[PDB]
Amino acid sequence: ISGNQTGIGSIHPLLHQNTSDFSEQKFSSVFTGDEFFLRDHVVRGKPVLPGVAYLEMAYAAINQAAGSEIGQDVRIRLNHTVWVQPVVVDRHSAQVDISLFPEEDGKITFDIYSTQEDGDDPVIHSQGSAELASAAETPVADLTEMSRRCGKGKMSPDQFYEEGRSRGMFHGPAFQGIKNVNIGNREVLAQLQLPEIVSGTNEQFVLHPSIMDSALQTATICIMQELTDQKLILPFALEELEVIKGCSSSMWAYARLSVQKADIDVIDESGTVCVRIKGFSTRVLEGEVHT
Template sequence: IVAGADAVEVHVELLPEEDGAISFEIYSGSGDAQQIHSQGQVAVGAAPADRGVVDLNALRAQCTSSVSAAECYEAFSGVGISYGPAHQGLAALSCGADEQGHRQVLAELKLPSCVSATADQYVLHPSLLDSALQASVGLSLGSQANQNRPLVPFAVDDVEVLGRCPRRLFAWLRWSAGSGEESAVRKVDIDVCDEAGQVCVRLRGFSFREFETGVTQAASEAFRIPQSGSMTFAPIWEVNGLVQAEGWPGSDRVVIVGGTAARRAEVRRRWTAGTDMEIPADADIEAIRELLQSQGAIDHILWLAPGETIVPDAEFVEEQARGVLQCFRMIKALLELGYDKRTLGWTVITTGSQAVRRDDDVNPSHASVHGLFGTVAKEYAQWQIRLVDLPPDGTWPLAELSGLPADPEGNAWAYRERQWYRQRLVPSRLSSGRSPSLYKQGGVYVVIGGAGGIGEAWSEYMIRSYQARIVWIGRRKKDEAVQAKLDRLAALGVEPAYIEADAGDEASLTRAYETIKARHGQIHGVVHSALVLRDKSLANMDEATFVAALSAKVDVSVRMAQVFGREALDFVLFFSSMQSFSRAAGQSNYASGCNFADAFAH
C-alpha cells in the first residue's frame, strides 16, 4: 500500500469459515478497482500447556558478534528505510552460528518509551513485532549479497501467538530450511520469548522480498507484482541426476514396516540387519507405541506402502487406515517416546502414486502419504526424510536407493525406467480461450462445497457468464450465512439450490443425486470444491482433526466418482491447492488430502 501526501482508505474484511476459522482480506478501492493487499486465515484455540523454552544462555555463548542498535538503524537508513521512534525497539543484536555452522541471531527488544503507555493494549505489541523482524538484518551483515537493497516483509507461513508479550523480549532468528543469504526470496524462522526464554510468539517461514535500488519507485513495480492477470504455475517431473549421499541405514537399528512379503524380503536381502514390524490396520497410537518400544532404540524406519495393485475405487477410503493414518499414528507414537528430540531416519516408499509421466497408470491409494511427510520434514528438521515413489512392478533400485540423500523440505524422488525424477513448479500459460468451452448456457452443475469461498466464486462466474443452474451440496444446514450467499447470487440469475448432505457418505450423496435428477433430469458437470482447514502442528493435532481435513478430499472424491460416475458428464472439476506442492508446516492433514485428490483426479 503506497501512501503519499493524501490519506489512503483501507478496508479489513473478516470472513467466517465453516470450520470456525476466520479468513481476512485487507484491500483498498471497490468494485472493479478493488485491490487485495494482504490475506490470510486466523484460527483461535487453547494455548498449549508447554509453549517451549529457548535456551538464551546457550544462544549468547554462540552469538558473540555484537551490533549496537544505533548501527542497525544506521544500516537501515543507508538503504532508504527510516524508522520513527515508535518502531525503534531493537536494544541489542548478536550474531553467530549454531553447532552445524548455520547463521543465527539473538536480538534484545524493548518497547520504545514513546509508546510505553500502549503496552497493555496489545497481546503482541506491533512495535515489538516489527523490531523482531528488523533483527533479520543480522542474518546478512557482512554478506556481499544484495547490498544496498532493503529487504521488506512479504509473507509468512504460520504465526502462533502463545502468550502475552512483556515490554522486554528476546528474538531468536535463523534461516528456514532451504533458505539462505543467496536466495531471492528469503525465509526466516523466529521465536520471540520473555527473559526466562519462554516462547510467546512463533513465526515460521517469514519471507522477505528486496526492493530494487531506488526505494522511491512505486511498491508494485519494486515487488514486480502484476496489476492485472494471473501468474500460473504447473508442477512437472523432470529427470534429475541422483546425487549420491553416504550409504544408509548406517546402523543395525532398522525397522521395516508394511509392503508385501516379497518386497520386505527383497529389502532385507539388501539390509540383512533390518527387523520386520507388523502393524495391524486398526492399531491405535497406544498399540503402535508399544510395538515401537519393543524394538528398542530405532535409528531408521523403512516404511513401505501396503500392496502394489490398484484397488477398486470404493476401497480407497479404507486404504487410508493402512497408509497415511498408520503413518500419522506412528509419528504420534514416536513423539510420545521422545523421538522429537532425536535424529531419526525415515525412508518412505510408495508405488505408482505419482503421475510422473502423462501416460502413467496412477495408484492414488497412498498418494496422501506424500503430503504428510512433506510436512513432517518441515516440522522435524532433525528427522532425515527420504520420500520415494517407485514403479509398482519390476526390481527396485535398492543400490541407488541406499545413496539417496535426505531432503529437508520433504520433496519426493520418483524412479521410472532407470531414471530419477524430481518435481518442480514451472510457469504455465492458461488457455487462450480459442478451444471450445465445455460450459453450456443454462447448464446444470453440481458444486460440492459450494457454500465455501472457492465454490461460491466459481458459481458466481458461471451464473454471470452462462446463466448456469447451480446446485450446492454441503454438510451444514442452510443457515442465514448460506442463505445470504444464495440471495446475492440470485440477483445475477437463477438462485442456486442448496442440498444438505454428507458428500463423503455414499448413501447420503446418492439421495442428493436422486433429488437433483428428479428436478433437472440431466447433470452437465460436477465440481469438487470442498475443503476443511484445521491447521495444527503434528504434535498438537489429534486424529479426529487429521481425519476431518483428509476425508474432505479422500472420501468426497471417491463417493463423487461412485455416485456421479453413472452420468454422461461434460467434465469433472477438482480444485487443488498449493499445499499439494509446498506442504507447509501445520497443514499435514490438508496436504495429505490434496495429494490424494490430485492423484485420484489423474
C-alpha cells in the same frame, strides 16, 4: 459499548469500526500518517503501513468476530499470510478494510484491502488465513545457549538503524526497538525494548507493532547475512504465527535461517516464547514503493 453515554471510540488502534453486514464480517480503519506505526516506518520517503500492523489487525478482527468461542485455552494462530501491495500514506489518508470468512473446516480466511471511491475495484494489500487452536504447551527458550551460539559479533542500534537509513529504510523512534544484536552463524539474538516514546501503549496491543517490527528487523539482519550488502528488503510472507502469551516491554528476538526464510521466536525475560513465527520471507525493493 459507549453509545450516547460517552463518545464512541475505535475498537482497537488498527481496527476502528465494525462494518459487518449479512454478506460479510468486516471492519474499517482510517489512517492519516500521524500514527506512530506510520510516521516512524518510512520507506524511501513514503510512510508505509508495516507488515506487522496487518498481523495485529487480523488478530484483533478475529478476536472480535470469534467472540466467546475464544475461551481461556484457545489461541489464535495465523497461517500462510502474504503482503501483496503496500499501503502508502503520503499525500492523503488511507481507508483500510479487513473482511473475514469463516470456512467449513474451522479455518478463517482474511483479506485486507482498500478502495479510493465507493464501489471501486478493491486493492488487495494482504491475504491470509487463521485458526483457533487449543492452547497446549508453552515453549521455552534457552537464552543462555542462544547467546552462546551468537558470539561471532555485536551489532549496535547505532550501526543497524544508520545502515537502514543508508538503504532507504527509516525506522523512526517508535520503531527502534532493538537494543543489541548478537550475530551467530545463520542465527541472531536481539534484545528488544519498547521505545520510551510509545511506553504508554503496551496494554493497547497483543502484537505490538514496535516489538513485532523489531522482531522482523532481527530476522532481516539474519537474512541479510546471505545477500548483497546494500539491498533494502521488506516483508513478503510468513507461513505461521502463533500467539502463545502476552508480549511485555523487554523481550528477545531469536531468529534462524530455515527464497531465504527465517523462523523467529519472540521471548520474554523469563525465557517463555510469547510469539512464534515460522517461514518469514522478504523481497528486495528497488526504486520507490508504488501502488
